[PDB]
Design an enzyme around this catalytic site. Structure first.
Site: not given
Ligand SMILES: [Cl-]
Lengths: 235, 242
Positions: A61, A185, A88, A9-10, A16, A90, A12, A115
């Site tokens: 990222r 992501h 990621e 995952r990318h 963030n 949307h 930070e 979330r």
């Protein structure tokens, strides 16, 4: 095992730190996220990892994290393929909003749904939204059809568009014995995790993948993991 | 103005000040060459350039130049295609040596012939050479056939394997209206400039392509330049290139 697959995952991002929902906004790595990416690349270097092909999204990222990993492992010459299908999720009209202020304005129960729910999308990003033209009119998406370009996505939506790429483009490389690195992501990587491990919706809702840490899968010939995912790094 | 094409030679590499032939050895950019690439990227950002696909070699000096340009113009998301056909010339046994050293080992006569000639290759890089396994057994060339994999290249040889990639892979993108950026090396870019401009062998060997400076061509529908190459940058950069 037959195949080795590595996900990351990318590192930070700058949003963030600002506590803002990023989604498709193209936030860069923070300085810390750059160090995390440099750490994950060093861990792969120390473990002697070789790849044959890399996939990533169209979001810097992720791309920069890939770049930093390829410079660390001295494999900048590898072929890299970018696709919006690894973006990621949307976040729709939530994009750019401060997450605390959104919980303040909507309450905990509504923001928890947005979330953490599997299939409830956030509200749409409409033309009045301050990042509408920044994202929906970005020419990197010029070739998506009207139906492909999302105004918002649930986690289910994100997976529904990530998996066709995994199946059509990534899986054939893996079956060639090509060693794949995917830099992407949390939510697009979760589609692949869920699919590889046959997780339920509840279990994928609970898994969090850390920024910038290599995740190693050992897959058999049916591309099923022969053991749990391993993280790479120091203690 | 049918098409706009941008070429960039890699920023100055770590070996330039040593006058050392890097060839297919994967030397990185020097500090100054990274600044050159940053300035080229800022020059392109300020002229507002937008691209649709990028081509580069498999060598880090060119790839890092591309990544630095794409970061500067905020186009990290563009598709990038790497190929050994845009590599620097393979300098063979001369790789790793400086000019004084090539003369001590091979003699001035052969050294001047290799330096001046379009089509006499340097000596091959055989299994005893310090960089033999480093280059010849590098995994990045594993898809080449035994006959494709060079042991040495004259400039004609380099142009001969770069132009097919230009003709087969890049020309068709340009004709579809894709705006192309090519980040590569002096000698492989020479193939493209020779071809675009119909230059003689002697003229393409004398032609300097400066490190790290964006070179803009405007081409008609036949891919012929409508005006000379434009070196893009600030006054100081353009004055040094010109
Ligand atoms: Cl790349």
């Amino acid at each position: 095992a037959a195949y080795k697959l590595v996900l990351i995952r990318h590192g930070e991002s700058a949003w963030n730190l600002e506590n803002r929902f990023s989604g498709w906004y193209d936030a860069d790595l923070s300085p810390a996220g750059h160090e995390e990416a440099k750490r994950g690349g060093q861990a792969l270097r120390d473990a002697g990892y070789e790849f044959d092909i890399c996939f990533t999204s169209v979001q810097k990222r992720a791309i920069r994290t890939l770049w930093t990993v390829l410079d660390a492992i001295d494999q900048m010459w590898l072929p890299v393929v970018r696709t919006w299908r690894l973006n990621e999720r949307h976040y729709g009209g939530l994009t750019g909003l401060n997450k605390a202020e959104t919980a303040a304005k909507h309450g905990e129960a509504q923001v928890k749904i947005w979330r953490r729910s599997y299939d409830v999308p956030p509200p749409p990003m409409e033309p009045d939204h301050p990042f509408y033209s920044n994202i929906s009119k970005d020419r990197r998406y010029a070739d998506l059809t009207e139906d492909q370009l999302p105004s918002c996505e649930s986690l289910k939506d994100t997976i529904a568009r990530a998996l066709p790429f995994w199946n059509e483009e990534i899986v054939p490389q893996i079956k060639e014995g090509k060693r794949v690195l995917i830099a992407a992501h949390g939510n697009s990587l979760r589609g692949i995790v869920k699919h590889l491990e046959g997780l339920s919706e509840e279990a994928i809702m609970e898994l969090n993948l850390p920024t910038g840490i290599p995740i190693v899968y050992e897959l058999d010939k049916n591309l099923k993991p022969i053991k749990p995912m391993q993280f790479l790094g120091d203690e």
